[PDB]
Design a protein around this ligand. Structure first.
Ligand SMILES: *[C@@H]1O[C@H](CO[C@@H]2O[C@@H](C)[C@@H](O)[C@@H](O)[C@@H]2O)[C@@H](O[C@@H]2O[C@H](CO)[C@@H](O[C@@H]3O[C@H](CO)[C@@H](O)[C@H](O)[C@@H]3O)[C@H](O)[C@H]2NC(C)=O)[C@H](O)[C@H]1NC(C)=O
Ligand SMILES: *[C@@H]1O[C@H](CO[C@@H]2O[C@@H](C)[C@@H](O)[C@@H](O)[C@@H]2O)[C@@H](O[C@@H]2O[C@H](CO)[C@@H](O)[C@H](O)[C@H]2NC(C)=O)[C@H](O)[C@H]1NC(C)=O
Lengths: 108, 105
């Protein structure tokens, strides 16, 4: 049997360090998306950042860069501060979810 | 003040529901305005709903709202694995959150 669910591309950096103010990019590649949708969340406080093409957070520093049909769901974090350091999760809305964790560090 | 400053009207009411029955988790907000209300499963950190769209592919989950103030998430045919904490979120800056517990018997 094969459910033909989506799957991640693990060949991406998952521990990213940027200097304060330097823009950070988190690369989540999802193949065979089908009818599913990809989301970015901030694990520390369970804050939804983006869901599909739409941005949920009102923090204008967060945007998801994805061209139509592409597998790349890059989370862009402009003007990062040390407060932004922590774990960010790329999750797929399957039942149960699929998730891939990313560590983001902002250095002074 | 900001002309639109959404706030939680009341804390979420804990709910207990027997297996196979429906349960409803209600989040009450004031002055939502252009902002968005979301429901999440805390234990698994899973996005369930955003506004009137169900995000999870769990077909047992639906969302309804009354006057953009009451945001009621419904869970059909409860499984014992549904027991746990659920979060209601508003996309303000900073974001606002409150949690309620669904107990299953
Ligand atoms: C909502 O419910 C949760 C969980 O309680 C569960 O659901 C209810 C509807 C009832 O059916 C309960 O019988 C059922 O277990 C409440 O959270 C719980 O809070 C208590 C403390 O208020 C925690 O109790 C323990 O306290 C002892 C010391 O007295 C410690 O040793 C323990 O480590 C623990 O702290 C309990 O763990 C906690 N349960 C969970 C799952 O988090 C919650 O307070 C309630 N909310 C409201 C508004 O009623
Ligand atoms: C994630 O990486 C951090 C730091 O990584 C740094 O940058 C990388 C590009 C690489 O060059 C590493 O060798 C660098 O150290 C690790 O965290 C520690 O972080 C503290 C402050 O955050 C720093 O002072 C320490 O020097 C870092 N320790 C080491 C050994 O790098 C962290 O352990 C990594 N986490 C995971 C899960 O891999």
């Amino acid at each position: 049997a094969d459910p033909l669910l989506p799957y991640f591309d693990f060949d991406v950096p998952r521990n990213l360090t940027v200097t304060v103010g330097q823009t950070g990019f988190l690369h989540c590649r999802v193949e065979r998306l089908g009818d599913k949708d990809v989301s970015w969340i901030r694990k520390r406080d369970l804050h939804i950042l983006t869901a599909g093409g739409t941005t949920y957070t009102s923090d204008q520093r967060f945007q998801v860069l994805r061209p139509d049909g592409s597998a790349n769901w890059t989370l862009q974090i402009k003007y990062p501060q040390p407060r932004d350091s922590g774990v960010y999760e790329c999750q797929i809305n399957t039942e149960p979810k699929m998730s891939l964790s990313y560590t983001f560090n902002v250095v002074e | 003040s900001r002309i639109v400053d959404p706030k939680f009207s009341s804390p979420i009411v804990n709910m207990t529901a027997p297996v196979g029955r429906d349960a409803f988790l209600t989040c009450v907000v004031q002055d939502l305005g252009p902002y968005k209300v979301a429901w999440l499963r805390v234990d698994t950190q899973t996005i369930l709903t955003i506004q009137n769209h169900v995000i999870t592919k769990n077909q047992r989950i639906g969302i309804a709202n009354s006057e953009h103030k009451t945001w009621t998430m419904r869970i059909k045919d409860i499984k014992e694995s549904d027991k746990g904490w659920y979060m209601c979120q508003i996309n303000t800056d900073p974001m606002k959150s409150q949690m309620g517990y669904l107990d299953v018997v």
